[PDB]
Amino acid sequence: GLVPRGSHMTAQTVTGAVAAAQLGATLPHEHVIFGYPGYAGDVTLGPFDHAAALASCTETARALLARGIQTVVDATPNDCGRNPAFLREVSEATGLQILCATGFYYEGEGATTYFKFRASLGDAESEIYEMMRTEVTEGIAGTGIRAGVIKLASSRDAITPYEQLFFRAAARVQRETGVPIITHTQEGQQGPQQAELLTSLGADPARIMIGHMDGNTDPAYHRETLRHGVSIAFDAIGLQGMVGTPTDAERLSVLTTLLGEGYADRLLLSHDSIWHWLGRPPAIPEAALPAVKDWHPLHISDDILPDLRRRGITEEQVGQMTVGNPARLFG
């Protein structure tokens, strides 16, 4: 239907180039490791235990492979603990394909001091553009590992001036290389705005996935976003009633409405799970346990798909969402 148009490079995973057909069932938004900005300053008591993270992540990778998932797109921002070399370790040890990102978190929670400083002194947008293009076409941090996607994020109330520097640089790398763009939206807002801004800047809608769209429960919101021709991702499936996220029941209700309206070619599914936290492992208060109970990477394969199927979603629609769409968007 709507295929990518323009410059295009082969999907780049942490262990190298992969043919679109080799992508297979994919979870489009996950984090093997993740650390909120500041975690590095807690290194004395929250050090990274490499051998333990490697064993724990390889184990999650193997379970994903057991479900038939061959690929995970790691959406971790550059300022949130991103580590391509660790990701490659996990990929080499298990055979699970992993793509990583190039990009910064949103203004509300990212490490924003650096680039705001750069922006006050000069043209931050060019510096950001140059970083993204380098990481996507040459490699990250001298490692030879390239980012297979650009990650963008924005705040609840507006795409801030700080965030726009990134949207503009990303659009330019998108136009030049064809690399896909996945995003974060805050609390169910700005999806239409991100799609509008990115398309108006010349980025290809067929190579754009607006994320955290499950954060809004009014289907008209998803529909206005989808009008732009972009894909949307229900990507925090399993995280319930936390930070006001809705329940999975709410998400599936919107999702089956959209599936019923013919939107399969534009819907992607993920959990935004964190397999291993950077910093001190988080202590989840008693009360919060249920909100995170289904928040792990086997939740869609074991619970959501069977649920969609029994509700009448067809095998073909599930295939389109988990295999067709990722094949087109990232390959």
Question: Which residue has tokens 């979603």?
Answer: 313
Rounded to a whole number of angstroms, the minimum distance from the CB of residue 29 to Co ion is 6
Rounded to a whole number of angstroms, the minimum distance from the CB of residue 163 to Co ion is 15
Query: With DSSP H G I counted as helix, E B as strand and the rest as coil, what are the percentages for the chain, rounded to 5?
Result: 45, 15, 40
**String of DSSP letters for 171-209:** HHHHHHH---EEEE-STT-SHHHHHHHHHHTT--GGGEE
x-marked contacts with Co ion along 30-59 as a string, rule CB under 5 A: ------------------------------
Number of Cβ within a 10 Å radius of residue 67: 15
x-marked contacts with Co ion along 60-89 as a string, rule CB under 5 A: ---------------x--------------
Rounded to a whole number of angstroms, the minimum distance from the CB of residue 212 to Co ion is 8
Rounded to a whole number of angstroms, the minimum distance from the CB of residue 264 to Co ion is 23
- Interface pick for Co ion out of 89, 163, 204, 272 (rule CB under 5 A): 272
Rounded to a whole number of angstroms, the minimum distance from the CB of residue 215 to Co ion is 12
Comparison of 170 and 259: residue with beta carbon closer to Co ion = 170
* Cβ atoms 72, 97 nearer than 8 A: yes
Comparison of 215 and 331: residue with beta carbon closer to Co ion = 215
Comparison of 125 and 235: residue with beta carbon closer to Co ion = 235
**Nearest alpha-carbon partner for 129 in 166, 100, 181:** 166
Classify the C-alpha dihedral 321-323-326-328 as positive or negative. negative
Stretch that binds Co ion, among 14-22, 113-121, 135-143, 267-275 (CB under 5 A): 267-275
Stretch that binds Co ion, among 6-14, 112-120, 190-198, 271-279 (CB under 5 A): 271-279
Angle CA 168–33–45, to nearest 5: 115
Annotated binding residue at 299?
no
Residue nearest to Co ion (CB): 272
Number of Cβ within a 10 Å radius of residue 169: 25
Comparison of 107 and 272: residue with beta carbon closer to Co ion = 272
Annotated binding residue at 42?
no
Comparison of 125 and 272: residue with beta carbon closer to Co ion = 272
> What whole-number distance in Å separates Cα of residue 54 and Cα of residue 43?
18
Comparison of 264 and 300: residue with beta carbon closer to Co ion = 300
Annotated binding residue at 8?
no
Number of Cβ within a 10 Å radius of residue 185: 29
Helix (H) or strand (E) holding 152: strand 149-153
Q: Which tokens hold the place of 32?
A: 């093997």
Comparison of 103 and 178: residue with beta carbon closer to Co ion = 103
Annotated binding residue at 222?
no
Q: How many residues does the chain have?
A: 331
Residues that bind Co ion (CB under 5 A): 75, 272
Binding residue ranges: 29, 31, 151, 184, 212, 272
Binding residue ranges for Zn(2+): 29, 31, 151, 184, 212, 272
